[model samples]
Target: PLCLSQQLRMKGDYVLGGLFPLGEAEEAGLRSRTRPSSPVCTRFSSNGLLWALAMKMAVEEINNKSDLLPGLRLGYDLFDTCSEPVVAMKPSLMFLAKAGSRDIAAYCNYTQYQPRVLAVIGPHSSELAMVTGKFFSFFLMPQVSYGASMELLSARETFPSFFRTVPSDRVQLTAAAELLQEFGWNWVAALGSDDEYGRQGLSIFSALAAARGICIAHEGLVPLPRADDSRLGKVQDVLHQVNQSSVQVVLLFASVHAAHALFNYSISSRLSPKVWVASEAWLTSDLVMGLPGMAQMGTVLGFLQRGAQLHEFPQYVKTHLALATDPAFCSALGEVGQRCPQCDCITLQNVSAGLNHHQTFSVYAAVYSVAQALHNTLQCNASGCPAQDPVKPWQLLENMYNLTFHVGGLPLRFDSSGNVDMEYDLKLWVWQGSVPRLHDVGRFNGSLRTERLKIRWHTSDNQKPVSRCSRQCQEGQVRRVKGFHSCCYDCVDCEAGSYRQNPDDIACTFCGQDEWSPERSTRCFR
Candidate 1:
């Protein structure tokens, strides 16, 4: 078996740099997400490397098939960012350095050693992608993300070179709000990570919740797991609020690392029962899988990935990893630490082994996207590509914009915003034994409407949580601002001889003296 990673002098082989989490850093000393009590290591996550390996495997498949980018092997220079932005920059600089030229003005011009790599495939977290995408865009190389889903990235002006295969948090946030409204959850708490992904998700969730007449009872940010006492107090404050507040549905948008302290506080404090509104971030994780008294904390309504399981993925992993288990395999590449060895122990034959069908599809689609763009750049016809020079990196941008391709039998296309049309499955977590497994209840489409989504309540009573600040204003009443949030308001009846027609009217209107409305009238009638 050939080593999957290598560094060869700028050759015709298309090189891609991977920015996924593969290395583990110590707990306290790390600048971000440091947990004092918990010994945090980057090696804790397997799926980050799963993304990278999927990229590598996809490239190899393209090489073997000779279908797209014919005779041009795709190579990669992979890095493990430890899931942190600071660590991600080091290898990113390496990838930029490989361009082998300082002249940004002539990047598109035909030149020698202008970075063999055409694009990048990772930095799975949205927070990290924003930081790295900034640098990648400046250099004119496309940064196709497999997992980042922040809606801001979709703004072409915000990130010109960034693209993603997953749905933005906007859709997820909208769908989540609709799901809550469907369940009569008028009052809820929202908790999000302090980072870009979490803050933006919570903001969107809050706005949508407001628009739908739902009230946010309590909202707070989850502190980074770093050992700062003030930040830790912030985490404690949220849990305390969750306990003290009457709100039952908590829309949590933090990561597993954030959850480490959250669940710890929940279990230790023996907090009252509240329905946990699980976001995609920590929904499928094992961190909170079998925790004590989790089932008692109200039924968790989880939003899941929209795709079905890929049967071929496990076979690919088993075959590729079975060969990679050889120590000699790592030695041959001279890149021992780069390869993830978690596959050496167990076989991921099913979802139980942690194969996320949707995530894997994203990685697979990303590779094929690059291949298709390359084909377009070379201007290949049925006979052969007649281009005399290597396909320039800038050439990939336009081709990628207009590119429509498929992978693993799924249609792959990007809209004007460089985002794919995304749909999500609404999942209900039930106890199968020790672990809480997701069962599909319904689906939410590109639009945030819950008309297509169906969900089974966690509780037998099928009752809902309510957190409204005030009752709905009558048709004859005018709404008046009372507090910082519009939801916190007071309704005043229309003045004498005045009429307010709309149910959501802000002020009363004057009617004709002869054709007047009654004291509590909604409209003028003779």
Candidate 2:
């Protein structure tokens, strides 16, 4: 059977294949999630690669049917990454740019090579994405991330070029806060993997929690110990500290393995936070399927790529399995391929693999988006997208940004933030039977975000400034402007018949006998 990946291999060495599961996942998403303590890897094993392969197949099916203009063809690239040295994704990007033609779209296995490809579909580790976001943005490449758990897209100006298909961890983090509020969780504790996933996620979670008046009594990073060594010490230290803090909610940043280690350590040491909130990485079907006890930590927050499962794909499923198992039938091209027996067994360990199973349905969708844009542009430009020009990286990106297209289950809406605010139902789940399964609770489509008070306060100086925070104050307070600090400088207290009109105000004025407000706090009317 001529598999799509095989077809690309046959298309000449121009094929740019990236990191595979063992290589990519272990680096960013699964590095800590899978290990001696975490059974998710053991449970799912190579099967988690199912999603990546499925998405790749989906892209291929699209590619198989469609014809492309010359100098502009479609191909998948490679990225080999590992769990440590967070920067493992960079070289892959550079490798693709240098190899043959520059028309390469990367999955998470990509490292930080800029100005090469038209776009990068993901760096699912929020940890990795945030650090490399500047590079991603600087190159004008749209990165549709799968593991963006924070409200990275919610606030676009903060990170210009970052984009994602699913809801960020921030939605989960804040949703957790709303849950805390609903349940009256006043004080909480946070724990997690120390890398980008943990730190970036928790930071947003902390901010949202703070906004909701949730007091995090204790927060700390937990490092994954090497399975080979006798290193429960790091886990032990984290447990010891949590016990001393006596906080209720625990936010976990590490993966399933670290979580499992922490769980048992918490039980043994009697130092577990009352409840735990973990990133989506914690909810791998593989982990839960294998280690049921790890689910006992409490509610975990995560996102499902689609409302349905990849199992829904029938024909593709049958072919993917066939291709993954066969090497001779579908030749493994070069050093990086789906299968390469002749190369080196260790080569399998070096390829980027984690990002494959990630929520790449959207990536398949993004390819369609480009196709749709090209299709539409062909109506007027008639010839084809300037992307057909080998020298025009900027044109390829422009056609993408300029074209109005929709893909997969969601519409593409890239704003100045480079984010497409597609709605994803917030799905909550738990580790039931050791597998991270969907919660019995129904999914909520729209999240409950805080509606900040829109106060149109005419300043004590009686000037209606553009914003409440930017208004100049009366005598007592200091002058204020947009993004500047201010102080209350009015008289100590509002004099009789005076009113306080600004955010920060002091003394009021006394209205003359003829002109006065009904109450002492009212400012005298003109």
Candidate 3:
């Protein structure tokens, strides 16, 4: 049987591997009992295509520069992940396959096997990265991801060679907790996709929220969408749970696909939360924002990973779309015709006009980081590289750990956990004429800062929605716990001769025998 996968290749002195989610695979039903057919991937991701282009552009930029790797030319083999773990592994195995050998052999000597590529750049999604990282780690190959930010990936014990340009979900969750506190959205519903990215995010956010005096009124999972009837039912169940609760604020830590399913169901059922706190994964998703009833879903806010504009990338894309000189990229474009007719017919004018700068910049940074590491490994200077031997994966991995370089004016380096420490932009989704726009309203570095006046609420009065488990206790009243959450309580007046001064007080104090006090007195007087 022939192993088939979509790939684009370029030849040079040194080759780098790249894995991108250029398309998403549709669920293939069992057609034959003996042999199952390969799943067909749909949805041509223009943003993902741009990410690949950015990688290509960065490689070319480095090759053009005389200071960096002057004697070497960098080449790449790009693979389409199809946004599926199984499909992603095909390319990963291909990258690691012993050159010119069709048979697998158990050899005690690891150095005997030569990998096709020196290092790998990405497999964007955390789910895909989790599988590929293990394979790359076993071979001691350096893998730098552009978007996979799951906190578990930070565990060096599991994936020593794994590195990412994006900050982990830990930082994003901290920012989320602070955002809730800032808006006084004490009570909220926390929902996450049933995957590493979502589960870990939900768990971390719940703990942080609890510590910060925020109450999770409802917590549930947004199951991964499948090409089955049950997929809709599962998402509907989660949305129903949210609908049954009194939480006006809903925090959704989900993948783009899961979020698309959830929001579609939400709009169909008219289960609109007063405010939706989106995770970075799908915060600025075009698919979610394009939903017909999105404007009716109330105010939306989220933290977006900061990114810089690449002035040359856009021009590079324009040039490539017209020229189509790169054989590998052109071949990948041809494959799009097999799955998606619209994608096959796409022209320069019809392509996505707006650029996803955040994700694309990460890809660009990933490429540069690899080049810098290679430069360090080869000990290249203005004169040229002295070492003539071929570059090894372990050698590159060692230097990547201590690498510190600048790309697009931002300094880039890996922390102890192989994750980047970066800032986030707090964005709010507001409807213009018919389109929804994500406006920058705040920022999160070490601390959270916001310009509240910039936010536009969806309410009739255009005021921030008050999301709380219970109303504030009046003056001289004590709070009595009425529910499981501390935030949920009943306000009661103080007993005769007792007084409660603060609204947050849970109990009232008795007055002295010489002094008399009213039932709800804030102070005792003689």
- Candidate 2 steric clashes: 55
Reference-based lDDT, residue 231, model 1: 76
**Residue pairs clashing, model 3:** none
lDDT of 2 by residue, 1-526 (tens): 2233333222321132323332332333444444333211111123324444544664565455534322334455534233222333454345345445555566464344434444455554555556555555544555555555555554445455454556566555655666555545545566766555667666776677667765555567776645714447777776666655554456665666666565656555554324554455655445433543444444444433332233344455555545545666545443323333322232233223443343556545544554454344443233335433233233334555534454544455554444444433333444335445554232333464322122111234422221111123444332322211121111243554565565353444455677655443545664
Residue ranges of candidate 2 with Cα displaced over 4 Å:
1-52, 64-73, 78-117, 123-138, 145-160, 227-247, 270-273, 284-314, 320-335, 342-360, 373-391, 395-405, 420-438, 446-526
Summarize candidate 3's per-residue lDDT along 263-352 as a digit string, tens digits: 888888887657888888778788888888667888888899776767766788778666564556656644611234444444566455
Whole-model lDDT values for every prediction: 0.68, 0.46, 0.76
Considering every candidate listed, which one attains the maximal TM-score?
Answer: 3
lDDT of 1 by residue, 1-526 (tens): 3333442111337787777765555556665545533223434345655666677677777877756776567776667777666667766766766555533343554335366478887578777888888877766677788888888788678677776778788777777788777767766777888866678888888788888767677778887676747877787788787667667788888777786667766777777777777888778877777577666666677676675354576667666566655767656655412443342233344213555556777877777888888888888765467768876677887778856877767676777777776578777776666777787776788444443234434466555544454556554567776423546556687776677767676777878887767676777777
- Runs in model 3 deviating more than 4 A are 1-7, 22-26, 29-48, 99-114, 194-197, 223-245, 256-273, 290-296, 324-358, 458-463, 468-526
TM-score per prediction, in order, is 0.76, 0.59, 0.78
Ranking by lDDT: 3, 1, 2
Residue 416, candidate 3: alpha-carbon lDDT: 76
TM-score of 3: 0.78
- Better candidate number, 1 or 2, judged by TM-score: 1
